[PDB]
C-alpha cells in the first residue's frame with residue numbers, strides 16, 4: 129500500500145505529552161474532557177471582517193493551528209495541514225438574555241468531542257452580547273494547544289487586530305514553528321537530560337500511598353468538570369505572595385493543609401501543572417505543559433510558614449527536572465494501572481488576563497481547563513493585579529455541585545485564616 133508509506137513519510141510522531149493526551153482520549157473517545165476553551169470580552173465595537181483577517185494571519189503564524197492528525201499502524205501522526213475553517217458571527221443582542229444565549233452557544237460547541245482526524249481542532253467565533261460588547265470564543269483540543277499557548281495566541285490576535293484596525297502593518301511575529309518544538313522534544317526523549325530528570329523523580333517519589341482526596345471515591349473522568357468559582361481580593365493573603373512562585377507556594381501549602389485537616393493524611397501529594405517552556409519554547413504556541421508531583425509532609429502542629437518553606441523547597445528542587453512526563457514517572461515506578469500519583473492538582477496561571485482590541489479594553493475568562501480527574505484548584509492572576517479568580521474543578525462522578533461549593537467556601541475561609549497568621553498551627557483552626 130503506497131498510501132500508507134506516504135502518510136508515514138509526510139508526518140511526524142506525536143510528542144510525549146501529545147501521546148499521553150491521545151491515549152487518554154482513546155480510552156473515552158466520546159468524552160469532551162480534552163477540550164480547552166476561553167472567551168474574551170471586548171468592551172467596544174468589533175468589525176468582524178477585520179477580526180477574521182487577524183485570525184487568518186495568526187493561523188499562518190501559529191502553525192500548531194494547522195496541525196492535522198492521521199492514524200497509522202505506528203500510532204497517531206501529525207503534519208502541518210490545510211484545515212478548512214470559518215469564524216461564526218452571532219448577534220445575540222435582541223435575545224431576551226444575550227449573555228445566557230452566548231454561554232449556551234459556547235457550551236454547545238465545547239461539549240462536543242473533537243474527532244482528531246477530521247477536525248476542526250479549534251473554533252473561533254464572535255458573539256455580540258450588547259451594544260459595544262463582543263465575546264471572542266476560543267476552543268482547542270489539548271493535543272494541539274495548552275494554556276500558555278492559548279494566551280500567546282490571544283495576545284497576538286489582539287495585537288494584529290489593533291494594527292489592522294489602525295491600517296498599519298503588524299510588526300513581525302516572534303513565534304517559532306511547532307516543528308522545532310517537536311524536534312526538541314524528540315531529542316529530549318533520547319537525551320541524557322531526561323535520564324537525569326527521571327532519576328530525580330524516581331528518587332523523589334521513591335514510594336507512595338493512595339493520594340489524599342476530598343471525595344468518597346476515585347473514578348475516571350468522563351464528563352465536563354463541575355466548577356465552583358470565587359473572586360478574591362489578594363489583600364486576603366497579605367503580601368505572602370507578590371509573586372507567581374510564592375502564590376503557587378501559598379496555594380499548594382493551603383490545599384495540602386486543607387486536605388490534612390479534612391482527611392488526616394500527613395503525606396499529601398499534589399499535582400503542580402507547569403509550562404515546560406525554556407528558551408525558544410517560550411514562543412511556540414502548541415501543547416507543551418506537564419504536571420509535576422509535589423509532596424508536602426504535614427508534621428505535628430506545623431504552621432503555614434513551615435508548609436510554604438517546604439513547598440518552596442520542593443519547587444526549587446524539582447522545577448529544573450520539569451520536562452519528565454508524570455505518566456512516564458507513573459509507569460516507571462510500577463504503580464497499579466489505574467492509580468494516580470496525585471488526585472488534587474493546583475493549577476496556578478499567572479497569565480495577563482487583559483487585552484486591547486482596537487483601543488478597546490478586553491478581559492479573558494476560562495471556560496474549560498482540561499480534565500478534572502478528582503479536584504483541580506485553578507487560580508487565575510494577572511501579575512500585579514489585586515484580584516484572583518479561584519476555580520474548584522471536580523469530577524462529577526466524585527462530587528456534587530453543592531458539596532463542591534461547601535468545600536470551596538470552607539477552603540477560601542481557611543485559606544484567609546492561614547494567611548492571617550503564618551505562624552499558627554494548622555490543627556488549631558476551626559473550619560465551617
Ligand SMILES: CCCCCCCC(=O)SCCNC(=O)CCNC(=O)[C@H](O)C(C)(C)COP(=O)(O)OP(=O)(O)OC[C@H]1O[C@@H](n2cnc3c(N)ncnc32)[C@H](O)[C@@H]1OP(=O)(O)O
Pocket residue numbers: 164165166266267268274275276278279372373376400401402403404405406407417443444447448449450475476477478494495496497498
Ligand atoms: C483556551 C483555554 C486556555 C487555558 C487552558 C489550560 C489547559 C491546561 O491544563 S495547560 C496548563 C496551564 N497551566 C500552566 O501552564 C501552569 C503555569 N504555572 C506554573 O508553571 C507553576 O505554577 C509556577 C508558577 C510555580 C511556575 O513558576 P516559574 O517561576 O515560571 O518556574 P519555571 O519558569 O517553569 O522554571 C523555573 C525553574 O526552572 C529550572 N530551570 C531548568 N532549566 C532552566 C533554564 N534554562 N532556564 C531557567 N530555569 C531553568 C530552574 O530550577 C528554575 O528555577 P529558578 O528560576 O529559581 O532558578
